[PDB]
A paper describes a structure:
Orai was identified as the protein that forms the channel’s pore and STIM was identified as its regulator. The channel is activated by the depletion of Ca2+ from the endoplasmic reticulum (ER), and as such it was characterized as the calcium release-activated calcium ([name]) channel responsible for store-operated calcium entry (SOCE) before the molecular components were known. The channel is formed from an assembly of six Orai subunits that surround a single ion pore, which is perpendicular to the plasma membrane in a cellular setting. Each Orai subunit contains four transmembrane helices (M1-M4) and a cytosolic M4-ext helix.
To exclude the possibility that the crystal contacts in the H206A Oraicryst structure were responsible for the conformational changes we observed in the pore, we determined the structures of wild-type (WT) Oraicryst and K163W Oraicryst grown in the same crystal form (I41). Well-defined electron density maps of WT and K163W Oraicryst were obtained using non-crystallographic symmetry averaging of modest (6.9 and 6.1 Å, respectively) resolution diffraction data in the same manner as for the H206A Oraicryst structure. Anomalous-difference electron density peaks for sulfur atoms of methionine and cysteine residues in WT Oraicryst confirm the accuracy of the atomic model. The structures of WT and K163W Oraicryst reveal an ‘unlatched-closed’ conformation of the channel that resembles a hybrid of the quiescent and open conformations: the ion pores are closed as in the quiescent conformation but the M4/M4-ext regions have conformations like those observed in the H206A Oraicryst structure. The conformation of the M1-M4a portion of the channel, however, is like the quiescent conformation, and as such, the pores of WT and K163W Oraicryst are closed and indistinguishable from the pore in the structure of the quiescent conformation. The unlatched-closed conformation has analogous straightenings of M4/M4-ext as the open structure, and analogous crystal packing. Therefore, contacts within the crystal and the straightening of M4/M4-ext are not responsible for the opening of the pore that is observed with H206A Oraicryst. As in the quiescent conformation, anomalous difference electron density for an iron complex is observed in the basic region of the pore in the unlatched-closed conformation. The density is positioned roughly in the center of the basic region in the structure of WT Oraicryst and located in the lower portion of it in the structures of the K163W mutant, which removes the top ring of basic residues from the pore. Thus, while necessary, unlatching is not sufficient to open the pore.
Residue numbers in the entry:
A (entry chain D), B (entry chain E), C (entry chain F), D (entry chain A), E (entry chain B), F (entry chain C): 148 to 180, 191 to 219, 240 to 327
Write the structure that this text describes.
């Protein structure tokens, strides 16, 4: 039952978060209407969420770990892009009269971005260690029974 | 119970995702206000979601696999269109003074689009193999009982 | 329990879908600000969803089949209208400078609209046949018991 | 359990429907920026939903029929107003150059509005009769036991 | 179980209602861009919802009645403000050419506002009486057992 | 079961609240298009929510207290920023013709901000005391059994 709820909660959140970000980012682009980066960022950001949303639909009818990677990787990737998107927006909006303030947006972007990716590495690192930790402990216990077995 | 939740979760997500995309895409069009493609893409994109939403309503009161195809196919088709829609938007917004940056939008579109369709093929391919895999295994087990039966 | 969930899921989806479409369509109209059709379509579309939403509220406290017709009919009717609405929007937005592209919107509208209504007819047709199918089978079984009864 | 779900489903739908309508109607007003009616309609519409939303909050901690009236009456009243609001919007947007089309909006409004209120009367009328129907049937059964009792 | 659901339903509704109102009110302000009141009302309204949202987050990990007051008071306070906000918006939008219609907005505001606060007083008054009612009934029953006890 | 629901409810609310605020704040910035503060505030605000949303995704597959800190701290931090964001918006919008009224926005901001942070301190302070309160009571009870044990 715990596993069923995990997918259920993940399905709604992923769709809700991915859909809104795509729509708002899209509208944000039309309102204003580095130069090349803005176009590429918006397109890539939307595509990532779309592919992820598809995963929610394909999994419904239904290797499991492989597909899981796509959902986690895409959702995470999209979030980072959204962060990159807003930074560009400020640069684009202020780009006309506000160029002076525009720089602060990207400069302050680096700090949070680094911590964002760095924090993920630490969490993952600890997880990997646990996998190995259990492996050593598991075989150890079996040997205990095996030894006494003889 | 597992089957009931599958439809329940799919119903909300499909409606939430399809509805928002339709509304935002619609508004995105009015804000700005290849040339012909923009009009066709928007209309087709919305229609796909609408038909899908209807499926959610018709199934509520209630061959099952046939209807399922419409929901999965439409939702997937709409997502691809939304991706095509945003690419056109950038081309439309920048189309005036920004034509130079405009190309990057469509050029970067090809990459994601290919993977989008290609990935679906792989997932489906594996599924088809499983159907056959079970067929061979099933008849095999029955023969086992049949042979011993004699 | 299966019946309770059916209404519960239907209540949320109907409200979420009907509300958003009404709001977006409303805003889409103010942004731009055949000519007569645009005004009539928007008003009628919103009214349908409103009446439907009311059904969700009235049923909460609580012939059952009769009211059900209003919910299914209204929701379905509204969806078709939303499709008609977007087609008009393209015609309205492009109508000024965009006439070249405007036509494609309505022309491509016909295809999806036809299939939309046509598909509903097929599904309903199969359902009606089932109702008659059961009737024949039901009386048949009773006769079996009736004959042996004598 | 059936009663608990009734309130739970009603709480979410009421809040979701009332909140969105209030926000969109509010934004619709700022975009454009009979004359007096537009101002009064918008303010009254929002107030109705707000009071209703409060009901959802006040009932959470917790005569029951009395409060129920406020929720049903307010939600229903607000829906009717929203319908009146959109009609005014078309009249306001087109009011400048579009007056010819503006009339169709209000004219087509009367039809749906009438049926909207008229339909409610029929449903309520049937309900009232049922209450009396049970009253007569109930006393009748008791008399049956009373007569045989002697 | 009844208590758990009460908080669960309250958590989602509060967040959904508070978040949307804050966002729309914020956008409504940028679109148009008494004079001083408009600025103060918007800031205060948003702050109230934010603090409330925090309550939802802080309570998750977890005197209970004290915190409850903040949620109910803030949510209720915010709703009243939202009502005050829309009235100001009409006054602001029409303030230019529409001053004549502007007055009707605030004038019609008084009626609903009065009933809003007044209705709350009646509901609370009845609740207080019940608390005392039970107190008298409780001691009475105990005395009954106490008397017969001797 | 109580613990499972806690995370489930927290997951949806966090995503819904964080996503909407990010989108609206983003759009609010494009509509208008201290000077430097506006750019920094918007970028930082969005980044906080994004990192938080990631937490919802990473925890799904799965020290527990450590990660919990990120979710609570980020969500809370973002809310405060949103409050700071709106204050800047008023200052930015009125900044042109409205400078006079602009001050009232920030001045009235201080009051709510102080109470916002101050209130959290009191709640946390009481919690800490309880932790120590239980510690003293716990050891005390064990001694009772320990003494009688001898």
């Amino acid at each position: 039952w715990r596993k069923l709820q995990l997918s259920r909660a993940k399905l709604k959140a992923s769709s809700k978060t991915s859909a809104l970000l795509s729509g708002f980012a899209m509208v944000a682009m039309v309102e204003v209407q580095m130069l090349i980066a803005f176009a590429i960022c918006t397109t890539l950001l939307v595509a990532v969420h779309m592919l992820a949303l598809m995963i929610s639909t394909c999994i419904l009818p239904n290797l499991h770990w492989y597909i899981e990677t796509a959902w986690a990787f895409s959702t995470l990737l999209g979030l980072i892009l959204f962060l990159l998107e807003i930074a560009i927006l400020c640069w684009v909006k202020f780009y006309d009269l506000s160029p002076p303030a525009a720089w602060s947006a990207t400069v302050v972007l680096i700090p949070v971005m680094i911590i964002f990716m760095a924090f993920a590495i630490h969490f993952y690192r600890s997880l990997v260690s646990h996998k190995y930790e259990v492996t050593v402990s598991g075989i150890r216990e079996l040997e205990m029974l095996k030894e006494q077995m003889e």
